[PDB]
Amino acid sequence: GKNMPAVQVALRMRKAGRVVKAGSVITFVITKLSVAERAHALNEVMIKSNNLIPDPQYYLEKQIFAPVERLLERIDSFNVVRLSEALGDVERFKDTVTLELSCPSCDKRFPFGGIVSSNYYRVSYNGLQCKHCEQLFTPLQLTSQIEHSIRAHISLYYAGWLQCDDSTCGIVTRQVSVFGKRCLNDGCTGVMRYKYSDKQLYNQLLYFDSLFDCEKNKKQELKPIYLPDDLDYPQLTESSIKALTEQNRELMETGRSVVQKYLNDC
């Protein structure tokens, strides 16, 4: 429909206010850029004050030359040259680890996947709901847990583990030599690297941000938190998803600001 001028015109009519439904006859004339974008509705072109002249090139070619070429194709002494002269984000979060949340009432632990299906939570109109106990989450009982996980992760980060590149040895440690990249094992040429390097923290924090992304939730690009074979595998419809996202915009935005507290400093 993007290279058909018809679909373009119908969508423009709908945006402008003209109601077009399936089974409609739309009448369109090309103005003077591709073939589709130049198109407009015939009544729109008709008003002479809009300065929407027909394209001489497109009409003289398509509505004349090709039909005339087909019609005169196999008639003696026809020449095409005479006729032509007379006319003319999925990879980034592959390693992230899920944000685990807890029930204020029933102490149940569960992973979270935005506004999607879940055997453990149900995104309601009034907010998130723990299916095992149906109790509603207050903003704090959510955001405090989230940033608890956040600060545990940053604690793991500044714990500053170190990794030996050389596969045959592969020591993990926190001792740092004054030649940081050189490994501490006798004669090891493996190059020392932090296991929890800053890039992974930034990936985790943007994964967090996606978990509370209203647009990504509407567009449904969010990474699936359950593999097909999981016994805890949950299907909600996109219309319900959009309605729940719009109703829960404020909670999504507060959860977003909580993560931005550590994003803008990341």
């Binding site: 704090l140 545990a152 500044y158 170190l162 020591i171 004054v178």
Partner: protein, 426 residues
Amino acid sequence: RTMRQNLQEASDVLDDQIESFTKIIQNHYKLSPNDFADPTIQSQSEIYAVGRIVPDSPTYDKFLNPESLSLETSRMGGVGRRVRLDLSQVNELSFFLGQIVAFKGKNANGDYFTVNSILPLPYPNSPVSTSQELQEFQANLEGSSLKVIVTCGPYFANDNFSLELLQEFIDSINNEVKPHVLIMFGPFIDITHPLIASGKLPNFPQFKTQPKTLDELFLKLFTPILKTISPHIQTVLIPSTKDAISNHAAYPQASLIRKALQLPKRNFKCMANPSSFQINEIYFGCSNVDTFKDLKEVIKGGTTSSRYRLDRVSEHILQQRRYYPIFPGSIRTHISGADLDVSYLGLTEFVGGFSPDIMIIPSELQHFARVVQNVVVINPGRFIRATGNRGSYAQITVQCPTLVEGEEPVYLHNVWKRARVDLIAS
């Protein structure tokens, strides 16, 4: 400073510490560079060696002994090659991770550097002040003594959020003690707090509009209470490695932003963790990481053991010229820890090489008041216990103000002669 950890810059800082303390050793002991050499290599002659103390194995047991300690060299000293240590000759030693020590000895065989003697690290200079400034401080105190009150977090129990003890303390300091300076370290709302960790956080009927984050939880919970401290009481704020309000989760730690915390400008200031400052003449040093609890020593010889542990650790802090000489940093396997920002390790080093008059380092241990090497170490303890019972806080009674020889007359501060540190329950 962004939240970035670079291995090479950290290595640079660790080389720098060895270099600087080697120069300090060579200056105070008036030794020449030629008398220092590489301790990791075989040598038939005694040498001076300076380095850090590390385990002989990068994957090392929790516990250490004097037969499994090694010395790492600087970049130019021994090309960063770590040499094991033979401590059998030295009867008395107090070693731990991250320190720096100066050894006399010799490398007999190549794989071991025998310690013949230990060169004790000189204690840093105490600060001085001129006569006129001391007289001005006298006028500021008007003959009266100085009162500084010191408290630490957290301020509410593990299971409830009642701040009656804090309110009683504020009433007391406003009406009876009348202190010139009040000190409060973080964390205020801890994030290893069990209820906030498990999300069991109930509605507050004492808030008209319920909060939404721990920031607004502070604003409605703590800002009311903190606004009752008397304006005549200048109060400082210190964050910690666990305060959820701060957007800094590492040590060294930046200050809080007083505006977003919404405290009046009249009597509150936000300082750094760690930081040093002067109240009149007294030169303070504040740090809020529990060196005392986590710093684990390896001790040989009776005399070192006989001493109080707190004195030993305080003298080690003095010798290392940094508030947290532990490296690698602490871990609570993972929930929390020291969270050392190694590339900024310089920020915790003593301000200009001056040991402070008072050094207050909150610990999860018991409270105490001890003076060592003429510096006032204070641990006012936790204001409220885990159960929620009473704690303790520090009250410092310094009398209103030795002469140093020199063409310019200055005066070494003597706080341990003049200050009375009382550890009163909350």
